[PDB]
RNA sequence: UAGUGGUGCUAGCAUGCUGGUCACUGUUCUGGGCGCACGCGCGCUACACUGACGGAGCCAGCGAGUCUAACCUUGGCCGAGAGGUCUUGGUAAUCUUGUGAAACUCCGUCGUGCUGGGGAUAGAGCAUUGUAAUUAUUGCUCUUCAACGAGGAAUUCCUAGUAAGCGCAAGUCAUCAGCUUGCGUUGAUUACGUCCCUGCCCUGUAC
């Protein structure tokens, strides 16, 4: 099987409700537990972080670290 | 709307890949040639191939097979100064390995070393 | 003319020369402010001689340093050594051996390398 | 259960390659009852072993 | 006072290149989007629309910090490692045709000028301009 | 406290570091405790430092490396393979991100979690060849060395052909090893060594 | 023939800071040759995310150079590149040269798919050295995209600024190295012991 690479409306709804459940999130965290490619996850984090649903604690290109807050 | 597989020049291309890279499935379409064609077509390079509509796969197909009209610098092309007729061409699809697998046979007909050595090795 | 000293530091091939004079608390490396030292990870390695003694000590002196050759890492150790040696040299001449040794106590408590080069040298073959 | 013991004397290198050191070690829980054991890694006096078996002694 | 030396390198570049694109006086060669910028490179610059302005800003800063430069030295600076396929890597200089036009383009708008002892030196108007962008960059924080 | 203004203004958060040294200016070494008395002389955590890039030289005397702080030791063991030799700055960054992650998965001062993983991992019984094997005791120093080796290897082989970065995997090993969690590679390795030694004694 | 600071002139910023421009520390000629079913050995490049690619940051040491005429080359100009052209300094701590080197650092693209890993083999064209490049010296551009998933039995080097990573200079030399020697940059883990294996050196009876 292959991960999704375009955002279906149903997964968009799934993303917004579920992500605040997780203590820690990262590119790997999304790609692992949700069937999306890494090229979505980089965009989704910037979206949700500007939306204020998750709190950044550090950012470093190759790594980024966001938290429930 | 989105199409998972498409066919052009009798080659299949899957939609799930960046358009620039997806096109390189076609014999003769290298990465640089693919990249520059997309720019001249002014498609969004970041779109995935399955996003495009028919009138957008056309124009692209047209530019690939008429490159000199769009002032591509000619030195970009793989068949400069052809031996029979001094025109420049770019070779695509099944037409690749029809000029290849012929120029060697033309050398065989003239009994040149390189042709003999090839067919002798076979 | 004005109370001033020069001091130098070493590491491997990097050679940092530092000048100190009375003035207003400023620290520049090659004319840039020391907060822009690079790479970022090693920047705190240069704050050490500031935090370890306390910023008040610097308020009346101007520090500027030029680092010359070496490499990206080795030059970092050269400047921090040049700073520390420069600081005690000024106190030795313009206050007292009491404060001088107070400085030396703080530095050598944390890292001997702040005052003395490790003398390592490449194998002669 | 594990028992701690303090190195009181080091006896010498042992084993075919010199890869094992023999040691004299004193029980830390109660002094004396001294025992001799085989130690694999580098060791010094005042080091503490964790004798997971107690009622056994090294050959000599 | 403020100097260009007082600002983080990449932070200053991003600010000034964006401004310079808005001025529009900086003139592009037009063959842009074909050239690789180095014979050691593979694929052209990925920021296809903006990359020329960003390089132009870098050159100005580098000359500002120094006595004078010429085209040869810039080709060395922007060089890189070429893979040479199965053979070991080697240093290779970047394209000249790019960098020479950048110097000429910057001269047209008066930031930089040809110098005695060869090469180019910063203009007094270059100083005046670049300092102003620096002050904005600090204050914009 | 006071802001002690200077003509090159140091940032506020750097001035605040003046009163207590913290690793990465972020965590204190105070209240870090070693649970097993046998290791206390070897798990150096007592001297504070700002960043795990000490220049010190430890080769000249055979026990002197026991004075090097534990955090420095970990960074070295990451620099391991031939494609990674010399790249210490790469390793330092890895550690910095690793501690942050552990500060969120669980909530303890993460330096304490590292110490727990080390002390819980080091084998206490082993064997040598005589052929046959005979059981032997292992000295506290070597217990520490074995801990550091097993940890980095368990992370490295999980991050090969990965979707999770090095820091994502190394952080999980440390957490799994501070627990009694047999899921971790390092704990699995400890068990076999001791049960083998038991049979041969 | 080196560095710092002051002094004179001077630019920008602000009302001091960063830059440019006196003191101290036999003979001979033409053409060819120096091919590969396979065995043994020293190497180069990889199997990817501790990565590949794009942009930006920006740091050495040891060498070597012409009037015998033509070496090392700065600056201006032309061209996508390789490369070309007009001038210039150095018989050298004085000029090339701060030999602005690579790894490396930061910000983006890619997302575990022989994939954007890897670049063998092969087609077309443009240049450069030489008296002459066909069986092809080297460089540049486009196209073709092979094996290879960390490798059985065996086996090499090594204890600190050392191993390993990375690059440069000289050597040979019309041109042409994946070679040899030297130099610098980044920089670990594991012993500080033994006679088990291998090999060397001392002092009569089952052989």
From Swiss-Prot, chain B:
Modified residues (N6-methyllysine): 39
Quaternary organization: Component of the small ribosomal subunit (SSU). Mature yeast ribosomes consist of a small (40S) and a large (60S) subunit. The 40S small subunit contains 1 molecule of ribosomal RNA (18S rRNA) and 33 different proteins (encoded by 57 genes). The large 60S subunit contains 3 rRNA molecules (25S, 5.8S and 5S rRNA) and 46 different proteins (encoded by 81 genes).
The species this protein was found in: Saccharomyces cerevisiae (strain ATCC 204508 / S288c)
Subcellular locations according to the entry: Cytoplasm
Post-translational modification: N-terminally acetylated by acetyltransferase NatA.
Keyword Transcription regulation carried by entry: no
One example GO MF annotation: rRNA binding
Protein name: Small ribosomal subunit protein uS13A
Record's keyword annotation contains Magnesium: no
Encoding gene per record: RPS18A
CC annotations in GO: cytoplasm; cytosol; cytosolic small ribosomal subunit; mitochondrion; small ribosomal subunit
Additional information: Present with 48100 molecules/cell in log phase SD medium. There are 2 genes for uS13 in yeast.
GO BP, sorted A to Z: cytoplasmic translation; endonucleolytic cleavage in ITS1 to separate SSU-rRNA from 5.8S rRNA and LSU-rRNA from tricistronic rRNA transcript (SSU-rRNA, 5.8S rRNA, LSU-rRNA); ribosomal subunit export from nucleus
Main location: cytoplasm
Family the entry assigns: Belongs to the universal ribosomal protein uS13 family.
Keyword terms, alphabetized: Acetylation, Cytoplasm, Isopeptide bond, Methylation, Ribonucleoprotein, Ribosomal protein, RNA-binding, rRNA-binding, Ubl conjugation
Included stretch of the parent chain: 10 to 131 of 146
Cross-link (Glycyl lysine isopeptide (Lys-Gly) (interchain with G-Cter in ubiquitin)), chain numbering: 27, 40, 71, 87
Covalent S-S links between cysteines: none
UniProtKB/Swiss-Prot annotation, chain D:
Gene Ontology molecular functions: structural constituent of ribosome
Pfam families recorded: Ribosomal_S28e
PTM remark: N-terminally acetylated by acetyltransferase NatB.
Gene3D superfamilies: Nucleic acid-binding proteins
Compartments where located: Cytoplasm
CDD domains for this protein: S1_S28E (cd04457)
GO terms under cellular component: cytosol; cytosolic small ribosomal subunit
Job of this protein: Component of the ribosome, a large ribonucleoprotein complex responsible for the synthesis of proteins in the cell. The small ribosomal subunit (SSU) binds messenger RNAs (mRNAs) and translates the encoded message by selecting cognate aminoacyl-transfer RNA (tRNA) molecules. The large subunit (LSU) contains the ribosomal catalytic site termed the peptidyl transferase center (PTC), which catalyzes the formation of peptide bonds, thereby polymerizing the amino acids delivered by tRNAs into a polypeptide chain.
PANTHER family in the cross-refs: 40S RIBOSOMAL PROTEIN S28, SMALL RIBOSOMAL SUBUNIT PROTEIN ES28
Assembly description: Component of the small ribosomal subunit (SSU). Mature yeast ribosomes consist of a small (40S) and a large (60S) subunit. The 40S small subunit contains 1 molecule of ribosomal RNA (18S rRNA) and 33 different proteins (encoded by 57 genes). The large 60S subunit contains 3 rRNA molecules (25S, 5.8S and 5S rRNA) and 46 different proteins (encoded by 81 genes).
Name by which UniProt lists this protein: Small ribosomal subunit protein eS28A
Gene giving rise to this polypeptide: RPS28A
From Swiss-Prot, chain E:
Tagged with keyword Ribosomal protein: yes
Keywords: Cytoplasm, Ribonucleoprotein, Ribosomal protein, Ribosome biogenesis
GO MF terms, alphabetically ordered: RNA binding; structural constituent of ribosome
Coiled coil residues, start to end: none
A Pfam match: Ribosomal_S19e
Effect listed in the UniProt record for changing residue 63 to P: Lethal in double RPS19A/RPS19B mutant, considerable decrease in 18S rRNA production
Family affiliation: Belongs to the eukaryotic ribosomal protein eS19 family.
Oligomer and partners: Component of the small ribosomal subunit (SSU). Mature yeast ribosomes consist of a small (40S) and a large (60S) subunit. The 40S small subunit contains 1 molecule of ribosomal RNA (18S rRNA) and 33 different proteins (encoded by 57 genes). The large 60S subunit contains 3 rRNA molecules (25S, 5.8S and 5S rRNA) and 46 different proteins (encoded by 81 genes).
Name under which the protein is recorded: Small ribosomal subunit protein eS19A
Source organism (scientific name): Saccharomyces cerevisiae (strain ATCC 204508 / S288c) (Baker's yeast)
Gene behind this protein: RPS19A
From Swiss-Prot, chain F:
UniProt entry keywords in alphabetical sequence: Acetylation, Cytoplasm, Isopeptide bond, Phosphoprotein, Ribonucleoprotein, Ribosomal protein, Ubl conjugation
Assigned GO CC terms: 90S preribosome; cytoplasm; cytosol; cytosolic small ribosomal subunit; ribosome
Highest taxon of source: Eukaryota
SUPFAM superfamilies, A to Z: Ribosomal protein S7
Keyword check for Ubl conjugation: yes
InterPro entries named among the record's database cross-references: Ribosomal_uS7, Ribosomal_uS7_CS, Ribosomal_uS7_dom, Ribosomal_uS7_dom_sf, Ribosomal_uS7_euk/arc
Any one Gene Ontology molecular-function term assigned to this protein's record: structural constituent of ribosome
Keyword rRNA-binding (UniProt): no
PTM summary: N-terminally acetylated by acetyltransferase NatA.
Localization per Swiss-Prot or TrEMBL: Cytoplasm
Annotated GO biological process: cytoplasmic translation; maturation of SSU-rRNA; regulation of translational fidelity; ribosomal small subunit assembly; ribosomal subunit export from nucleus; translation
Pfam families, per the entry: Ribosomal_S7 (PF00177)
Cross-link Glycyl lysine isopeptide (Lys-Gly) (interchain with G-Cter in ubiquitin), where in sequence: 26, 179
Residue positions where Phosphothreonine is found in the record: 8
Subunit structure: Component of the small ribosomal subunit (SSU). Mature yeast ribosomes consist of a small (40S) and a large (60S) subunit. The 40S small subunit contains 1 molecule of ribosomal RNA (18S rRNA) and 33 different proteins (encoded by 57 genes). The large 60S subunit contains 3 rRNA molecules (25S, 5.8S and 5S rRNA) and 46 different proteins (encoded by 81 genes).
Family the UniProt entry places it in: Belongs to the universal ribosomal protein uS7 family.
Name the UniProt record assigns to this protein: Small ribosomal subunit protein uS7
Primary gene name: RPS5
């Amino acid at each position: 099987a292959q991960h999704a690479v375009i955002l279906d409306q149903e997964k968009y709804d799934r993303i917004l409700k579920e992500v605040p459940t997780y203590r820690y999130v990262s590119v790997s965290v999304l790609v692992d537990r949700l069937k999306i490619g890494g090229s979505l996850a980089r965009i989704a984090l910037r979206h949700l972080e500007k939306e204020g649903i998750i709190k950044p604690i550090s950012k470093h290109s190759k790594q980024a670290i966001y938290t429930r807050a | 709307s989105f199409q998972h597989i498409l066919r052009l020049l009798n080659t299949n291309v899957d939609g799930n890949i960046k358009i620039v890279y997806a096109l390189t499935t076609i014999k003769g379409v290298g990465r640089r040639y693919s990249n520059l064609v997309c720019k001249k077509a002014d498609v969004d390079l970041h779109k995935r191939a399955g996003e495009l509509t028919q009138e957008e796969l056309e124009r692209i197909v047209q530019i690939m097979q008429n490159p000199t009209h769009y002032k591509i610098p000619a030195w970009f092309l793989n068949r400069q100064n052809d031996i029979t007729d001094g025109k420049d061409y770019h070779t695509l699809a099944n037409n690749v390995e029809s000029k290849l697998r012929d120029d060697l046979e033309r050398l065989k007909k003239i009994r040149a070393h390189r042709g003999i050595r090839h067919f002798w090795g076979l | 003319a004005v109370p001033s000293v020069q001091t130098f530091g070493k590491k491997k091939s990097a050679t940092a020369v530092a000048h100190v004079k009375a003035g207003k608390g400023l620290i520049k490396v090659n004319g840039s402010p020391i907060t822009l030292v690079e790479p970022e990870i090693l920047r705190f390695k240069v704050y050490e001689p500031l935090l370890l003694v306390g910023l008040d000590k610097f308020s009346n002196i101007d520090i500027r340093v030029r680092v010359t050759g070496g490499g990206h890492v080795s030059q970092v150790y050269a400047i921090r050594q040049a700073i520390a040696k420069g600081l005690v040299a000024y106190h030795q001449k313009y206050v007292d051996e009491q404060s001088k040794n107070e400085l030396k106590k703080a530095f050598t408590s944390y890292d001997r390398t702040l005052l003395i080069a490790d003398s390592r040298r490449p194998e002669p073959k | 259960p594990v028992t701690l013991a303090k190195v009181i004397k080091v006896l010498g290198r042992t084993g075919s390659r010199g890869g094992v050191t023999q040691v004299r070690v004193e029980f830390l829980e109660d002094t004396s009852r001294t025992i001799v054991r085989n130690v694999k890694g580098p060791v010094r006096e005042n080091d503490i072993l964790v004798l997971m078996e107690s009622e056994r002694e090294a050959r000599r | 006072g403020v100097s260009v030396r007082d600002v983080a390198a990449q932070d200053f570049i991003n600010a000034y290149a964006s401004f310079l694109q808005r001025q529009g006086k900086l003139e592009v060669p037009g063959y842009v989007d074909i050239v690789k910028t180095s014979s050691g490179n593979e694929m052209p610059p990925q920021d296809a629309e903006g990359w020329f302005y960003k390089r132009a800003a870098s050159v100005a800063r580098h000359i500002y910090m120094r006595k004078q430069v010429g085209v040869g030295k810039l080709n060395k600076l922007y060089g890189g490692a070429k893979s040479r396929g199965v053979r070991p890597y080697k240093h290779i200089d970047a394209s000249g045709s790019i960098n020479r036009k950048v110097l000429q383009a910057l001269e047209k708008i008066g930031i930089v000028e040809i110098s005695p002892k060869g090469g180019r030196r910063i203009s007094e108007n270059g100083q005046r301009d670049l300092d102003r962008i620096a002050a904005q960059t600090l204050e914009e924080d | 406290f006071t802001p002690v203004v200077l003509a090159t203004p140091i940032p506020e958060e750097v001035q605040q570091a003046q009163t207590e040294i913290k690793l990465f200016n972020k965590w204190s070494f105070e209240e870090v405790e070693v649970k097993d008395a046998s290791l206390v002389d070897y798990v150096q955590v007592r001297q504070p430092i700002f960043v795990a890039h000490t220049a010190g030289r430890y080769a000249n005397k055979r026990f002197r490396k026991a004075q090097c702080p534990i955090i420095e030791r970990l960074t070295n063991s990451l620099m391991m393979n031939g494609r990674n030799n010399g790249k210490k700055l790469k390793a330092v960054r890895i550690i910095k991100h690793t501690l942050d992650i552990i500060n969120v998965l669980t909530d303890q001062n993460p330096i304490q979690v590292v110490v727990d993983a080390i002390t819980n991992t080091g084998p206490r019984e082993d064997t040598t060849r005589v052929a046959r094997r005979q059981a032997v005791d292992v000295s506290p120093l070597r217990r520490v060395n074995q801990a550091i080796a097993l940890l980095t290897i368990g992370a490295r082989e999980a991050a090969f052909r990965n979707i999770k970065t090095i820091a994502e995997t190394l952080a999980e090993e440390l957490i799994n090893a501070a627990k009694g969690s047999s899921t971790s590679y390092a704990i699995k390795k400890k068990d076999e060594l001791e049960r083998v030694a038991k049979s041969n004694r």
